[PDB]
Amino acid sequence: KHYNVKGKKKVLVPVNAKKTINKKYFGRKVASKKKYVVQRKLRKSIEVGKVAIILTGKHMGKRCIITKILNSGLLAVVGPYEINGVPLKRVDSRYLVVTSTNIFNFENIAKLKDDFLNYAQDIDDDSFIKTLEIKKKQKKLLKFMNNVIDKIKEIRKEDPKVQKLEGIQKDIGSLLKPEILKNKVFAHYLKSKFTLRNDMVLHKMKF
Amino acid sequence: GIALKNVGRIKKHGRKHLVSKNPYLRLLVKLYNFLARRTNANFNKIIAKRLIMPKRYRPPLSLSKLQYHMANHPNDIAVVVGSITDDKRLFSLKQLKVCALRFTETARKRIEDAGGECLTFDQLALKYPTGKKCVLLRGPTKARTAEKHFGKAPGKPKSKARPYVRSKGRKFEKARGRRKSRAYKK
């Protein structure tokens, strides 16, 4: 569903209302006057086939391949775990640098696109959202040092949503590993971290 | 910056609310302000404005004067935003209908005896909402004795201002500077 004012064609999503305020005289009221929020949209080059740099977290500067835009403006990404150790991660556009390089411009891999899409198709935004009960169990351990790290990983490992996601991640890896690997230079490139040496001029380069 | 007369703050003049601390008078200004604000009638606003006025401005009114004013329409009700005072010059009175702030004791007795009607402002409001068939009156205002010392200064040509004196006999302010004989005349 959409509104098309001045030819823009913005596209509407049903969004909840959650903030309440004490109102002018008597009771309280919901803040929102609206119900439909405009959909996010993206940087022009972002699509399934691209390899991208992860810029923020612990895995920073790894080169991971984009998978599914997960409806809500958040995307999924994998630099196949069995090649490169990057898991099935959800990440935002503005923490991820998408390159011009596309996985499906390699012709052995270009046959395998639909299958990659089906494996991707099953996972969704709701699979990544952490469950409150699990968090509470984890918190309830806190109140020696090795045990804490071990326990936390054990609790995370137990989770069904993690297990389900992990199964998919392994399946994608299983599909891809030899085919990516065989093109040796490309394999090394994927494995190797992004960097920013004294040679580079960030603004100047056509990244 | 900008340039405006009194830097853009408007200056209204005269009263802003009543000074009087009297509860009854406070009640009356509240009532008439309410009538003024709700109705568009000019009667209500003027009554409200006049009601606020200080003590010198609302004068006492003589009965005789009131009769002279009511004479050409004696069916109707005089309202007077002051006190009405009695008169011994007035021989008789032809049953007037008067709203006033305050009645001198003798006047009320006379008006009542004549078969007339003495209204307080609350009563006037209740009976008549917009001043319908009413006549607003007020007495001699400038005629107060104090004002005769005002205006173009005493002893500046022709001007009729009263001086101020200890007493008005022949040795007090009646020689040099008030006649041809002794220096300049008045």
């Binding site: - | 910056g1 900008i2 340039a3 405006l4 408007i10």
Partner: protein, 167 residues
């Protein structure tokens, strides 16, 4: 026929006649703009304040843009106006209903080529409070016609280019 006049100069140190003319002209605060009906009388008054004002001829696009984007209008009771940004028609459909020139477009039409209902419509708008120019002036010190950098007086056509920078 019309002339948009922009003031150029501070409150301080102003000759007394010039101050009086400014008050009639209706440009008080220092970057204020107003439309003025060209005549003989208006032009002479304008001549007196000349070294202190730029002015010129609008063109249709300039009027339309200025009226929408920076027009304010006098809302309240007689000589106690209060300043409201135009925003919608019911304001002007009140005051200019009698003169049959209500509608904001209709106000553009009356102003741009001087219509019969000019005095009210000009009066009714609040004076334009303008923002400074993006690439600045050149010199409030001199006339536009002085061959130096300079700005004061008649700029005829070029007033629009200046207005577009400083809208």
């Amino acid at each position: 026929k019309v002339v948009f006049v922009i003031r150029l100069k501070g409150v301080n140190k102003l000759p007394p006649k010039v101050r009086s003319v400014f008050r009639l002209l209706r440009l008080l605060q220092v970057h204020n703009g107003v439309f003025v009906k060209v005549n003989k009388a208006t032009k002479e008054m304008l001549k007196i304040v000349e070294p202190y004002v730029t002015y010129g001829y609008p063109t249709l696009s300039t009027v339309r843009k200025l009226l929408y984007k920076r027009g304010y209008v006098r809302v309240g009771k007689v000589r106690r106006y209060a300043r409201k940004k135009i925003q919608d028609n019911a304001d002007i459909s009140k005051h200019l209903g009698k003169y049959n020139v209500h509608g904001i477009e209709d106000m553009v039409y009356q102003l741009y080529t001087c219509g019969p209902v000019f005095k009210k419509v000009n009066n009714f708008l609040w004076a334009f409070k303008l923002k400074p120019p993006r690439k600045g002036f050149k010199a409030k010190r001199h006339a536009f016609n002085e061959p130096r950098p300079g700005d004061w007086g008649n700029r005829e056509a070029h007033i629009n280019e200046l207005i577009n920078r400083m809208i």
